[PDB]
Design a binder for this molecule. Structure first.
Ligand SMILES: Oc1cc(-c2ncc3c(N4C[C@H]5CC[C@@H](C4)N5)nc(OC[C@]45CCCN4C[C@@H](F)C5)nc3c2F)c2ccccc2c1
Ligand SMILES: Nc1nc2c(ncn2[C@@H]2O[C@H](COP(=O)(O)OP(=O)(O)O)[C@@H](O)[C@H]2O)c(=O)[nH]1
Ligand SMILES: [Mg+2]
Length: 168
């Protein structure tokens, strides 16, 4: 089994740091903000061996046809914001609508991720994030790429959401 996972969200929220924790087991400071890359990892989740193919998105805000078709191959999406950046939380709606648009579907596996939970300078309350996730009908996972809090949980929860979708 293989799952195509895509990590989206505003610049600086920790998409690259979360991905590199999952894949390479270390915390990277100031990874080049412009680099989009992909990684594969073999995991066991609830007894099922699978390959996670993870796209760590980056780059300019552009909407080419090639970009839509490429994003459309994603089976599940992490919607990442940082808990110290209210604008990144406000931007979650945008990324969700673009995912719906390219997938031509109201039911796309997604997980809301509030990253940088190790920082004291919080501006987005856990209750606001839980309420947003409830409104979308998706899970909310608190993470820190720095301490590895919630990292496996975020990705594995997204796989569980894909499996639920495939059962419908
Ligand atoms: O063809 C596509 C294209 C995208 C797509 N690709 C890149 C985006 C992009 N950048 C890339 C990364 C992340 C931030 C920065 C620029 N570096 N930024 C935004 O939005 C940014 C905000 C919020 C809205 C207005 N702008 C201005 C400010 F407010 C902030 N959206 C993007 C975006 F939708 C798709 C995304 C998901 C599903 C299918 C897609 C299909
Ligand atoms: N304290 C803390 N810093 C983080 C966390 N995740 C990312 N960072 C830092 O925030 C900055 C932006 O992270 P990055 O992974 O490049 O974000 P991206 O633009 O979403 O790929 C970098 O300096 C990271 O080291 C986190 O969970 N906690
Ligand atoms: Mg990055």
């Amino acid at each position: 089994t293989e799952y195509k996972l895509v990590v989206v969200g505003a610049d600086g929220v920790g998409k690259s740091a979360l991905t590199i924790q999952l894949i390479q087991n270390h915390f990277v400071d100031e990874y080049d903000p412009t680099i989009e890359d992909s990684y594969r990892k073999q995991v066991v989740i609830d007894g099922e061996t699978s390959l996670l193919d993870i796209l760590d998105t980056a780059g300019q805000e552009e909407y080419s046809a090639m970009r839509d078709q490429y994003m459309r191959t994603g089976e599940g999406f992490l919607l990442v914001f940082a808990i110290n950046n209210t604008k990144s939380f406000e931007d979650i709606h945008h990324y969700r609508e673009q995912i719906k648009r390219v997938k031509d579907s109201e039911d796309v596996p997604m997980v809301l991720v509030g990253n940088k939970s190790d920082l004291p300078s919080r501006t987005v309350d856990t209750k606001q994030a839980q309420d947003l996730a409830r409104s979308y009908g998706i899970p909310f996972i608190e993470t820190s790429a720095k301490t590895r809090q919630g990292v496996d949980d975020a990705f594995y929860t997204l796989v569980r959401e894909i499996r639920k979708h495939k059962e419908k």
